[model samples]
Target: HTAHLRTARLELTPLDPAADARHLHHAYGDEEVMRWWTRPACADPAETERYLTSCAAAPGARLWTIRAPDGTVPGMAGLLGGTDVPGLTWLLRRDSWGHGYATEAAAAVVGHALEDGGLDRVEAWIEAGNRRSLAVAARVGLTERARLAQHYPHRPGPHEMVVLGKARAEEPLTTLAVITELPVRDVAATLRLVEAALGARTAFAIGDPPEFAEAALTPWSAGPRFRLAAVPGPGPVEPVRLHLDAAGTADSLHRRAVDAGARVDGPPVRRPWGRSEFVITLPEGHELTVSAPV
Candidate 1:
């Protein structure tokens, strides 16, 4: 796991100069391959050897050999620099162009960098005319965050560079559970009606002469479960409505509720607020409204 990362069509192995030196030398020797780098060509195999020597052991670096299914090393991708300002960089042999290998390779690297490498975002700098790389950045979910007229040692004069960036939250947003008590008459009967209305299953129950039970739902998988209970009350509380909104065909859910013996207060009708909804009342006088977004 330490040195292995894979995609559907790529094998990303940790950069090992002992095995990858030849491909590295081959990739850098071509004119098209080095057109957008800090310098044009690798000069010679000696220069490439020195660059690979440093790349094989850069501090806090994660350099990878991008290989195809045929076991040929086509290029490399890397997350470089200090962990605080991690950047994504890659290069491929010109023969591998137009195959979408670079974007897939960069996606795998960025996915891991943000998750385990203490990276919040990935940044890449591309020269203005490198349209191939610009398309790759867009395909890999990085946007053009800025463009600047800057200096590049690879080019003789001032050049315009596009900065691409994508920031992910350090932790994914937490989901909250909705818990509410529904005071009912016959717990079993009401449970059946509730299940028929919401297409939900029960998770657990508390009282034996059972007073409370849970509805197994989305958020309830982790936190407090939504409860339906028999609270001591008379039949029919007026002006009380319980609304349940879910993603479904509103008319179909309406038909199911009506077939399950609910008193149809209204049919599924499209509302001015861009929803198709229907209303019904349970035997215990609790009004239930089901709606779906259009």
Candidate 2:
């Protein structure tokens, strides 16, 4: 999960198909906004759902809904792919034109890439003659590095593409995300227990379709968020075990779980094996062992 990001007056939130599918479908329906994009405009709502499903499964990918100052979701953007510099992509609804939102969102993502993401650089490939996009790139401090004769399936012939890049000093990544799929029934009940154990908040949730009651958790501290998807099929997943640095004292973490009606399989114990932790059983028959560093 990507950490929630904020700019001067914009909120970049994680995208949820259950809540955003309809608008997203319409956003891509605009021909003008889809002009520069390689893919043809999305013509069906099902296509948008497929798009969101794929995004959720993509590794190291973070897609965000760009919420302007007034809480309108008029654009979408993301830092995607796994490379020295992942790609920064954005799209604005036609109604959002002339607001400079693209540049603002892109700049915020660039700063996140270089500073918090532990990446030395960030880059984008822009089709030639897309002056507006090129200008947005420059505004975000990405100078044109090279031009390439790239071919795309959407184009009949070769097109000139410009590569732009920006770099900063290297540092350790301060933000990280981890998603573990546990196929279990009653996801909401399972995640409630998760909240007690990890001391996390339900950042987002959905009840649509009534099949998958899923939610993403925001950690109590500045750490990776977790997602719990409760769905049909595959009841009581094989015990998924997690070994994590405890939020505080191992005893306190254990007590919180116990207080929340969790099944404590064992008492907190310290062993010579650097084992100073306890185990609790999730409703799915999955087991989580949390330990604190000495």
Candidate 3:
């Protein structure tokens, strides 16, 4: 919430947490809500203080708390990752759980994250048997990407974890799917011109139009589908902000390619504190990052 806002009966207090005793206790001292949750599930006042302090002070982790419409701490949410793949995390106080607050707050936060932060993807993980959380995960536009059993020591006894994820790869780095706002007078003429310039690589299609205007996707990426839209705008600034990062056991191939001739903006220096990474910058400032292990 930009300023404190209320929804029906709930008043929300969005904080970007100061070291306040009251805020800390209200968020953590409610045992009914904290149970079964990871991070700080125990309703210990002192422990909540310690956790809040760490959260406020943590590097690269953007944290926010959800409060009742009355300004009481209802729960918390987090974007916990580096500049690369910023993962999403949230937890609601028990009293506030059934009010659709999770969906309400999370949708707003996720949209803000995509717009302001320019995140490529956002995700969360839930234990297999956590039905409530699993449903919440889907309600917020995340799809189940994978499930892992005994992946980590956090859960008890080879627990299964559901990976909930969303991606903003419509305007992919490897390929461009453009949404043009050209004048309708040259509809056929524009198609010919684009196809000529792009060498028949583009696809033209109309979609569920939300914004009133004309558009085109000169070429699509390798992904399943892409979104192209047009609305009134102040001319085009060419194209910009294309980014890519390789994950999941891709070390060997990335190194060989980098060694050959790709313009590596950064070297394969292990980020001793976090993850290992190297990057290659392509035409028009697109970045291809190669990361080691998970």
Candidate No. with top lDDT:
1
Candidate 3 local lDDT, residue 3? 38
Q: Using lDDT as the measure, name the better of candidate 1 and candidate 3.
A: 1
Q: Which stretch of 10 consecutive residues in model 3 shows the poorest summed lDDT? A: 209-218
| Residue-wise C-alpha lDDT for candidate 1, range 1-294, written one tens digit per residue | 156789999999988776787787777888778877776678777777678767656677788989999877889887875535567788898888777889989999888887776678888888889998889888888888765444444554555678898878534675445577767766666667767766656777767656888776443465433567776766554435766665556667878877777778778888776567788776767777876653
Instruction: Return the TM-score for each candidate structure.
Output: 0.54, 0.55, 0.50
Error of 2 at 240 (Å): 53
| lDDT by residue for model 3 (62-98), tens | 6666666566665666577453556776677666668
lDDT by residue (1-294, candidate 2, tens digit) is: 757889887888887877776777767777778788767777777777777767766767777888888778878877776634577788888888678888888888888878887777877999888888899899989988765444445655445778998889435674355666665576666666667766766665666422344344444443445456665566446767766555345666777888888888877888565546788777667777776532
In candidate 3, clashing pairs total 5
TM-score of 1: 0.54
C-alpha positional error of residue 146 in candidate 2 after TM-score superposition, expressed in Å: 1.4
Predictions in order: lDDT: 0.74, 0.72, 0.53
Model 1 lDDT on a 0 to 1 scale: 0.74
Give the clashing pairs for model 1: 207-210
Decreasing lDDT order of the candidates: 1, 2, 3
